[PDB]
Write an enzyme that holds these catalytic residues in place. Structure first.
Site, mmCIF file in Angstrom:
data_model
loop_
_atom_site.group_PDB
_atom_site.id
_atom_site.type_symbol
_atom_site.label_atom_id
_atom_site.label_comp_id
_atom_site.label_asym_id
_atom_site.label_seq_id
_atom_site.Cartn_x
_atom_site.Cartn_y
_atom_site.Cartn_z
ATOM 1 N N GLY A 119 35.078 12.477 17.030
ATOM 2 C CA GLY A 119 35.439 12.156 15.654
ATOM 3 C C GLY A 119 34.242 12.422 14.768
ATOM 4 O O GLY A 119 33.748 11.523 14.094
ATOM 5 N N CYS B 83 35.638 1.430 -1.649
ATOM 6 C CA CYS B 83 34.216 1.146 -1.827
ATOM 7 C C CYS B 83 33.954 -0.229 -2.429
ATOM 8 O O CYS B 83 33.064 -0.943 -1.973
ATOM 9 C CB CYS B 83 33.569 2.231 -2.683
ATOM 10 S SG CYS B 83 33.521 3.836 -1.872
HETATM 11 N N1 LIG Z 1 42.748 10.873 17.626
HETATM 12 C C1 LIG Z 1 41.676 11.477 17.061
HETATM 13 N N2 LIG Z 1 41.134 12.603 17.591
HETATM 14 C C2 LIG Z 1 40.060 13.221 17.052
HETATM 15 N N3 LIG Z 1 39.448 12.766 15.940
HETATM 16 C C3 LIG Z 1 39.897 11.647 15.306
HETATM 17 C C4 LIG Z 1 41.060 10.916 15.839
HETATM 18 N N4 LIG Z 1 41.280 9.864 15.027
HETATM 19 C C5 LIG Z 1 40.335 9.911 14.055
HETATM 20 N N5 LIG Z 1 39.525 10.977 14.227
HETATM 21 C C6 LIG Z 1 38.368 11.385 13.405
HETATM 22 O O1 LIG Z 1 37.345 10.391 13.494
HETATM 23 C C7 LIG Z 1 36.653 10.336 12.250
HETATM 24 C C8 LIG Z 1 36.374 8.892 11.850
HETATM 25 S S1 LIG Z 1 35.327 8.878 10.431
HETATM 26 C C9 LIG Z 1 33.714 8.958 11.142
HETATM 27 C C10 LIG Z 1 33.226 10.392 10.978
HETATM 28 C C11 LIG Z 1 31.812 10.670 11.494
HETATM 29 N N6 LIG Z 1 31.659 10.197 12.909
HETATM 30 C C12 LIG Z 1 30.797 10.022 10.593
HETATM 31 O O2 LIG Z 1 30.059 9.144 11.029
HETATM 32 O O3 LIG Z 1 30.679 10.341 9.406
HETATM 33 C C13 LIG Z 1 37.500 11.064 11.213
HETATM 34 O O4 LIG Z 1 36.718 12.132 10.675
HETATM 35 C C14 LIG Z 1 38.720 11.583 11.942
HETATM 36 O O5 LIG Z 1 38.957 12.970 11.671
#
Ligand SMILES: Nc1ncnc2c1ncn2[C@@H]1O[C@H](CSCC[C@H](N)C(=O)O)[C@@H](O)[C@H]1O
Ligand SMILES: Nc1ncnc2c1ncn2[C@@H]1O[C@H](CSCC[C@H](N)C(=O)O)[C@@H](O)[C@H]1O
Ligand SMILES: C[N@@+]12CCc3cc4c(cc3[C@@H]1Cc1ccc3c(c1C2)OCO3)OCO4
Ligand SMILES: C[N@@+]12CCc3cc4c(cc3[C@@H]1Cc1ccc3c(c1C2)OCO3)OCO4
Lengths: 341, 341
Positions: free
Chosen positions: A120, A316
């Site tokens: 993610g 926010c």
């Molecule tokens: N089932 C799934 N498979 C793959 N990615 C997923 C998912 N469910 C959520 N996500 C991803 O997980 C992310 C959570 S947000 C966190 C984003 C990043 N790790 C950061 O710290 O900025 C999102 O971008 C979303 O696209």
């Protein structure tokens, strides 16, 4: 007495001032604290274990596709969408993102030459950070968003990074025999419908030498789904759809060691997240006109644009109240380091 | 200013009244709470994990042989030497022992026909309880005390129980290929120098179908060795020798899941332990003359007898202050149910 639709109407029309908005959301979270805290530790553990057991029974059975230009106008330089770390009162969101990336690298024991998977990975700030800092690492981001994959690949190209790949997959459906020295999960586990199976799947992508680092929004004492307790809560279901987000307690993942074993455990005080959402809100407010213009062709109407903006801004505003509650000592960020069983 | 030896002298001469004695010990535990509680959960976890990590480094490197007649005069009917459970204000120590045994049977999911091992079985109250209630169970107590083994075997004979055996062994040195459906560890883990190796050893005595139930004195928030913080604490080292007893936090064992996996987790409020030690103190006081007579031939002098009695009585007085602190919401009893990895 006032309905959900009445408060929602005023919110969408920009008729609720920031003071009242914060006050209303703080009260909603106050009621969550009343719901979660029990009179005795005996009762607290009974409550907490019931929650944990219910998550294990979920073994039986948000839109991250917003335009990059808008996300650039609201978030920091690497478009980090997770709690950042603020050393000083004057620390910028850009500096806080970098500090958070450095914190993850330290705690996940990232070393040059490792294969790294970021589950993610969002807009890939951490992926790009590790790839740039550790040239001999091979860093893989995994995301279910085409837009996110495309953004990361473009950034890797612009940054002359040759050690990045992105897997486009739903992590819960992704099948691979590939293993990684380091797996990072930064504020992604909150979206997982099935945690026990998630941790099991992750363990199959690890060898004996691997480490798994998980960072998640938490409450220090209890777990809860991010949802309305009662009819008075207009906020929770507006921010996230029902069943989307789980807020685990700071210790909840200790009960998910079927396939991985804990090595270390930390929390980061909620003021860091509070300062993160505050910086995003302020940047969105500063770039309001620009954001409106960016969103207009993709959405259709100024009203649909106002809707997306109000959603993010209220996220926010609400997040500030949640994470700053009792000077960051209620909702915060939990971090855990695991090895494979 | 007064020395340890000065307070100790007055204590051994029976010159400190119960009011002052309780007050002094409560203050000592008050200082332990100041030592253990940190300003933020971030700091609390840093403190707690440092403690947990130190226990894992102890992988590198009390006298339970008192006469049965004396123990009978101080403790309840089955000479249970662990926290009991009190339903009512009028619940007797005998009833509380039985209630505690029943509680263990429920939570450890004891069923007729199982092989049961009770590690550090003491005077065998739980062993005898299970053997009598479940005639098709085979129940093994393990103790390092010859006197305890002999007492249990005699009791089993008197109770016409044919399903009891006792292993005389130091559990840390005991080697066996034998496995058990149920392993129970009731307030024995506090004596374990090496917890990670202890849990590992226990797991080798389990099959896939086995459950492990651990009950331990705890503090709800932090762990500590039962020892003096400072020179003002005359109490802790008088009760237990240095390095004998560790008070784990209510969650400490969640970090010891290398070889076992948590299934459930409870605490029992400290007032139950408080009522237990109070009942023992009161019974010892009632049987004071008798206790003195019982101990005299085995020890040698009335002064050596007074010494053993003062030790046990002060243990109870001190225990009352410890476990009743903030109505049982500081020190209490933790219970955990595990399966094998
Ligand atoms: N089932 C799934 N498979 C793959 N990615 C997923 C998912 N469910 C959520 N996500 C991803 O997980 C992310 C959570 S947000 C966190 C984003 C990043 N790790 C950061 O710290 O900025 C999102 O971008 C979303 O696209
Ligand atoms: N290394 C070791 N091996 C075996 N038994 C031990 C031990 N260290 C302590 N013990 C035993 O563990 C017991 C702790 S007291 C608890 C006794 C019993 N479970 C009850 O609830 O009443 C003592 O009786 C002591 O004999
Ligand atoms: C990753 N997270 C997943 C789950 C979650 C849940 C939250 C939260 C932040 C989050 C995080 C961080 C975050 C930041 C900005 C976002 C965002 C999220 C969602 O979604 C759109 O914009 O604050 C209150 O509840
Ligand atoms: C089993 N435990 C092992 C460790 C421990 C440690 C304790 C405690 C009780 C116990 C128990 C319960 C007990 C009860 C009566 C006893 C006793 C113990 C020791 O030793 C002699 O007489 O109260 C404060 O600290």
């Amino acid at each position: 007495k006032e309905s959900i639709g009445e408060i929602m109407g005023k919110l969408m029309q920009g008729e609720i001032g920031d003071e009242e908005l914060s006050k209303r959301i703080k009260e909603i979270f106050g009621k969550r604290l009343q719901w979660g805290y029990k009179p005795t530790h005996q009762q607290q553990l009974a409550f907490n274990l019931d929650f944990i057991k219910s998550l294990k029974e979920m073994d039986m059975s948000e839109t991250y596709e917003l335009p990059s230009a808008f996300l650039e106008a609201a978030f920091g330089k690497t478009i980090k969408q997770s709690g950042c770390y603020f050393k000083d009162e004057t620390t910028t969101i850009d500096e806080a993102e970098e500090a958070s990336h450095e914190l993850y690298c330290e705690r996940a024991q990232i070393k040059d030459g490792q294969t790294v998977l970021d589950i993610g990975c969002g807009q890939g700030g951490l992926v790009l950070h590790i790839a740039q800092k550790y040239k001999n690492c091979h860093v893989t981001g995994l995301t279910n968003s085409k837009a996110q994959k495309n953004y990361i690949l473009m950034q890797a190209e612009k940054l002359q990074l040759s050690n990045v790949d992105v897997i486009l997959a739903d992590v819960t459906k992704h099948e691979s025999d590939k293993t990684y020295d380091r797996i990072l999960v930064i504020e992604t586990i909150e979206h997982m419908k099935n945690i026990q199976l998630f941790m099991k799947k992750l363990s199959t992508w690890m060898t004996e030498d691997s480490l798994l680092f998980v960072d998640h929004i938490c409450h220090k004492t209890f777990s809860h789904h991010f949802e309305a307790i009662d009819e008075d809560d207009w906020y929770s279901g507006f921010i996230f759809p029902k069943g989307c987000v789980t807020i685990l307690s700071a210790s909840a993942l200790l009960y998910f060691q079927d396939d991985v074993t804990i090595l270390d455990h930390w929390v980061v005080n909620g003021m860091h997240m509070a300062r993160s959402v505050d910086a995003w809100r302020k940047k969105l407010d500063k770039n309001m006109e620009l954001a409106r213009e960016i969103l207009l062709p993709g959405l259709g109407s100024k009203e649909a644009v106002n809707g997306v903006i109000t959603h993010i801004r209220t996220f926010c505003m609400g997040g500030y109240e949640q994470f700053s509650y009792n000077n960051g000592e209620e909702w915060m960020v939990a971090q855990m380091l695991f090895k494979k069983k």
